[PDB]
């Protein structure tokens, strides 16, 4: 945290600075100081080059692993080309695809992814803001932006907006006197990246450029490990399991091959051979298209996602530390309550004005409304009518604008009133008077006599009144009412609302002629003994969807923590409003208040909810923070500095949770930058928050956050299904080569054949899984533990490889035997044949029958086998597709049927295979031969068994949720 000079006297400060308070630095001195220190500018990271952006992706996890395969596949090509020249594309091309998959895969992401007013030599002049240096005198007024960090020497009625630091917009006063030990808290310092809302002030520049509090946040919050995405972390667990098996078997097939009588030449080639089988080449692309496809839906939702990984990040978090202003809220506020007819009323604060009407009827109400509209200077900027009232910009102070907006809304045009009762004279609100009054000609034509209207400090207005308009009629101001007012005044004040008193007087016509002149300068007319009409307070409302959005997250099992720069009374009120604090929940202070016991007396454990001021937070050790975090379900950190927001997040992360920071302002930057995922508001959001964030809510629709979390759920599951679906086919692809070596039988399936499965046939089906629905109420479950529940786990491998893929292999092997057997080569004869079969020289090979086959002839038969094997997989893949559609549910229950995309997959997939078989040229180009109709049927019993086997298994899982089948098999 920073350490400073606010303690120093102004004179002391100048002494340190070698500057003059009145005159400011000399032109000569300013220049000298410039060269010494450097410019009032932030030192950048460099822009980031285009080349590097692409290159970083090239590693992308699986990408590197794929390199090891390609390189290792080259290990095969190198040894082979050397010692045993096998002229073939097999290992070379095999190796090539793996790497290129990254270059082509990487594309998926690339294709989808000022002036200041200073005083120098006693004269003020405007200068390029960069020219500002520490020491000079700067003047700021309402509407301006603070040019640099400043020490307030002098100020008049100056208010500032420090949302950049706090995230809270309500204006803060600036005075020369140091308010608090904390520099972020004190009144005497005005910070760059902040704007003077109103008033005028002068201060001495303490810090410039990078040195300012915010001018560093970026570097401190930017150069911070913005952590990664829960999805990225998960997409690595599966690959390790996959690699684990690929290596186990790959090598195991080295040793086994060795015992059988294969050399270092042969045993080695197999190990590397054993790859295309364990590594899913298709998987990266699928996950990406899945992520990309989901993002598209969200876009349709009016929810734009900058990062693919961002689609999921919405589910593996325990606690969420949210910034209030611009994150939870849209950034705004207004009036709130009125007191008249000895009763407290509540106006609708909402933008939408979704609330209800409090009171039209009272005669009192109108008299009050009259003063609010008349004793009021504010005006709406011109050309507003298109926009709604609460939205439109008004010229005038906040309190007056509030009254104007209130009346315009409930009353109709204010201008109408202003016209109907012309303003003759008024005494503008004085600092001393603490009240503002006006005199107006009454619209009432019988009367058009003079009416006096005034407003100001509630205590002051009361000092001024004789009577009270209760209902339509006036009444003496008995002590009884004097208190009822006093109670209302205290209560509304408690709400954290600003309160104004209102009263009017029907002037006695005799004393005031129609012409009668009034004197604003000296009380030409009565200031005292007036009729007190009522009270009006203030208040602020949050977005519409937010309370529900908060509710949804909580059901999700997500902890929502407010983290705001704003003051605690306000923070807590909204916390209750949004649901961060639930009804009945209590802080220690509320208990002590109700009990009327001391705080020391209250047991902290009794309080579920907490509200911690930044000033207090500052004193606490991180362990203390951790306990507060552990100890409470509903937490509100208020009046927090930007660094504090960061600490909370770190504290939350220390627990192990995945935290999403949602915020709008420059003050949220370090937090957003720290969060596992930073979400920023698109419209309201400062540029800084936007740069800091992972995601932008273009709409400022908070509800989108719920969708975001949801997006990380359905697809995550559906992705596993697509992995399972893709991986299963690996087995039927691997086994033929192995048996080929072990059995010494002719090669059942070829390298080219595999590619058509992986690149052609499996693709649409695999992708189609994304369309799958929820088997259960996904929202109902807790977020996944990123560490514990991986995307690809051992239960997936066992299911894909051990069971299902195994059934698939036999289906393929069967077609193999049928084709050869039909051809005259019975299975028994097949063993040990490959050497003769492969032997190019022998034109003579004798089959079981006794016939003799040439080299080409038998080869055509084998190629036909390659073709039928290919087909067998597609037939079995149909079953795998249907079963993969659901993890728990029966096809009957889910209806395998609804997914249109999936069904499209079966038809097109089969069409492709038939094409490869039937089309002419395919026999040369891809060595695919035509298949007799009978050949199509061979795998059919195998396909059916798979469907039944899985269906039976899931029925088991459902019946006994607790135990074994689920434990082993359940993805």
């Amino acid at each position: 945290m920073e350490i400073n000079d606010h303690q120093l006297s102004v004179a002391e400060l100048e002494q340190k600075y070698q500057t003059s308070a009145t005159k400011g630095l000399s032109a000569s001195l300013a220049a000298e100081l410039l060269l010494r220190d450097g410019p009032n500018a932030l030192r950048p990271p460099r822009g980031t080059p285009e080349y590097v952006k692409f290159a970083r992706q090239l590693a992308g996890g699986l990408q590197c692993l794929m390199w090891v395969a390609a390189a290792i596949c080259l290990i095969a090509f190198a040894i082979q080309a050397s010692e045993g020249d096998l002229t073939t594309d097999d290992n070379l091309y095999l190796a090539l695809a793996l790497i290129a998959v990254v270059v082509v895969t990487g594309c998926f992401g690339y294709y989808q992814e000022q002036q200041a007013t200073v005083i120098r030599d006693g004269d003020k002049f405007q200068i390029n803001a960069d020219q500002l240096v520490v020491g000079d005198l700067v003047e700021m007024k309402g509407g301006d932006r603070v040019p640099a960090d400043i020490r307030i020497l002098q100020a008049q009625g100056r208010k500032v907006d420090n949302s950049s630091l706090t995230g809270e917009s309500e204006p803060q006063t600036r005075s020369p006197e140091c308010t608090h030990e904390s520099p972020l808290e004190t009144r005497n310092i005005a910070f760059f990246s902040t704007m003077c809302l109103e008033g005028t002030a002068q201060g001495l520049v303490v810090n410039t450029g990078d040195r300012t509090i915010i001018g560093r946040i970026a570097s401190l919050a930017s150069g911070v490990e913005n952590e990664k995405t829960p999805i990225a972390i998960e997409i690595e667990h599966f690959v390790d399991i996959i690699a684990g098996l690929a290596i186990l078997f790959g090598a195991t097939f080295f040793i086994v091959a060795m015992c059988i009588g294969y050399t270092f030449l042969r045993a080695m080639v197999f190990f590397m051979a054993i790859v295309v089988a364990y590594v899913p080449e298709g998987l990266l692309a699928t996950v990406t298209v899945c992520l990309s496809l989901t993002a598209k839906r969200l876009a349709s939702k009016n929810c734009v996602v900058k990062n693919l990984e961002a689609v999921e990040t919405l589910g593996s978090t325990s606690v969420i530390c949210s910034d209030k202003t611009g994150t939870l809220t849209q950034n705004r506020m207004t009036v709130s309550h009125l007191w008249f007819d000895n009763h407290i009323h509540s106006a609708d604060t909402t933008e939408d004005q979704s609330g209800q009407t409090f009171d039209q009827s009272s005669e009192t109400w109108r008299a009050l409304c009259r003063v609010l509209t008349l004793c009021n200077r504010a005006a709406f900027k011109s050309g507003q009518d298109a926009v709604p009232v609460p939205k439109r910009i008004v010229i005038g102070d906040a309190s007056e604008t509030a009254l104007l907006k209130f009346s315009e809304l409930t009353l109709g045009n204010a201008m109408g009133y202003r016209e109907r009762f012309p303003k003759v004279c008024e005494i503008p609100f004085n600092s001393t008077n603490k009240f503002q009054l006006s005199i107006h000609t009454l619209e009432d034509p019988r009367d058009p006599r003079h009416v006096l209207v005034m407003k100001g400090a509630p205590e002051r207005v009361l000092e001024r009144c004789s009577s009270i308009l209760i209902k339509g009629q006036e009444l003496p101001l008995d002590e009884q009412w004097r208190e009822a007012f006093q109670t209302a005044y205290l209560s509304l004040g408690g709400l954290g609302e600003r309160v104004l008193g209102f009263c009017q007087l029907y002037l006695s016509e005799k004393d005031y002629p129609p012409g009668y002149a009034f004197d604003v300068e000296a009380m030409n007319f009565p200031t005292s003994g007036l009729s007190f009409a009522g009270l009006v307070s203030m208040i602020d409302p949050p977005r519409a969807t937010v309370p529900d959005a908060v509710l949804k997250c909580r059901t999700a099992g997500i902890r929502v923590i407010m983290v705001t720069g704003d003051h605690p009374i306000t923070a807590k009120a909204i916390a209750a409003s949004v649901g961060i604090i639930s009804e009945g929940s209590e802080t220690v202070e509320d208990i002590a208040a109700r009990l009327r016991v001391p705080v020391d007396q209250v047991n902290r454990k009794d309080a579920r909810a907490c509200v911690i001021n930044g000033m207090q937070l500052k004193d606490m050790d991180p362990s203390e923070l951790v306990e507060a975090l552990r100890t409470h379900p509903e937490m509100v950190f208020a009046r927090t500095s930007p660094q504090q927001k960061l600490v909370i997040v770190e504290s939350c992360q220390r627990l192990g949770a995945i935290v999403a920071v949602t915020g709008d302002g420059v003050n949220d930057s370090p937090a957003l930058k720290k969060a596992d995922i930073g979400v920023a508001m698109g419209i309201a959001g400062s540029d800084a928050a936007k740069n800091a964030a992972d995601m932008i809510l273009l709409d400022d629709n908070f509800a989108s956050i719920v969708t975001g979390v949801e997006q990380g759920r359905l697809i995550f599951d559906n992705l596993k299904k697509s992995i399972a679906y893709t991986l299963t086919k690996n087995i039927p692809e691997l086994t033929p080569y192995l048996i080929y070596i072990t059995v010494s039988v002719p090669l059942p399936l070829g390298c080219i054949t595999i590619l058509f499965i992986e690149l052609c046939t499996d693709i649409f089906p695999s992708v189609s899984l994304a369309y799958e629905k929820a088997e259960s109420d996904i929202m109902h479950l807790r977020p996944r533990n990123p560490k514990r529940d991986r995307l690809v786990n051992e239960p997936l491998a066992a299911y894909s490889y051990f069971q299902i893929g195994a059934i698939q292999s036999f289906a393929g092997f069967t077609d193999y035997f049928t084709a050869m057997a039909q051809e005259g080569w019975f299975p028994l004869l097949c063993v040990g044949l490959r050497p003769q079969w492969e032997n190019h020289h022998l034109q003579d090979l004798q089959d079981s029958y006794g016939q003799e086959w040439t080299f080409g002839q038998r080869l055509y038969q084998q190629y036909t086998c390659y073709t039928v094997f290919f087909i067998s997989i597609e037939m079995c893949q149909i079953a795998d597709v249907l079963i993969r559609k659901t993890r728990r549910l029966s096809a009957f229950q889910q209806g395998f049927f609804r997914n249109r995309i999936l069904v499209i997959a079966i038809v097109f997939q089969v069409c492709i295979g038939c094409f490869l078989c039937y089309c002419p040229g395919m026999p040369n180009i891809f060595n695919f031969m035509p298949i007799r109709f009978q050949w199509w049927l061979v795998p059919m019993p195998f396909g059916l068994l798979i469907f039944v086997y899985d269906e039976i298994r899931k029925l088991g899982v459902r019946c006994c949720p607790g135990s074994w089948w689920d434990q082993e098999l359940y993805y």
Binding site: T814, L842, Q843, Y849, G850, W853, N924, W964
Partner: protein
């Protein structure tokens, strides 16, 4: 990784992989049923005969003469084994790949079958069935020679099985 539950795993697969081998075999054995003992379901692969040669690149029986095809009868077991007819500058021997019920039809480069045999009945039907010189001037060089057979029934696949109905070999007698 469990304990006192592995018995629930081992026993599972024992009679699940059991059930599956049992079904897999179940379907091979049905398939096998629907094939002739004497003749494959598809001849088509073998459709044109290939020609292969010797150089690695009779008691009982019947006396015969060069003549027309001899029909043994149908391809059936009711008759016993169908009777079969009797039968430097390297010598190479050529034969025609045997194909059941196939009747072959018949009724300068550098310097360098009887119908009575067919149709071939097949091994089951005919076990000890018997199917039916380059003195050249040149030497110390690689000579490419292609021996081939002709017939309407015979076809060649130049682009593919160079074996189909023909040979291609490169003799070299370096002396």
């Amino acid at each position: 990784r469990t304990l006192s539950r592995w018995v629930w795993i081992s026993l599972y697969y024992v009679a699940f992989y059991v059930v599956m081998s049992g079904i897999f075999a179940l379907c091979i054995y049905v398939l096998m049923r629907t094939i002739d003992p004497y003749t494959p379901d598809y001849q088509d692969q073998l459709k044109s005969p290939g020609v292969t040669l010797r150089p690695d690149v009779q008691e009982g029986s019947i006396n015969c003469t060069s003549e027309k095809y001899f029909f043994q009868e149908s391809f059936l077991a009711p008759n016993h084994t169908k009777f079969s007819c009797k039968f430097g500058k390297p010598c190479f021997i050529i034969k025609m790949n045997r194909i059941v019920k196939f009747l072959p039809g018949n009724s300068d480069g550098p310097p360098l079958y009887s119908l009575h045999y067919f149709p071939y009945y097949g091994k089951k039907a005919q076990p000890h069935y018997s199917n039916p010189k380059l003195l050249n001037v040149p030497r110390n060089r690689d000579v490419v020679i292609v021996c081939k057979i002709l017939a309407e029934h015979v076809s060649f696949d130049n682009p593919h099985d160079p074996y189909e109905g023909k040979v291609e070999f490169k003799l070299k007698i370096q002396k």
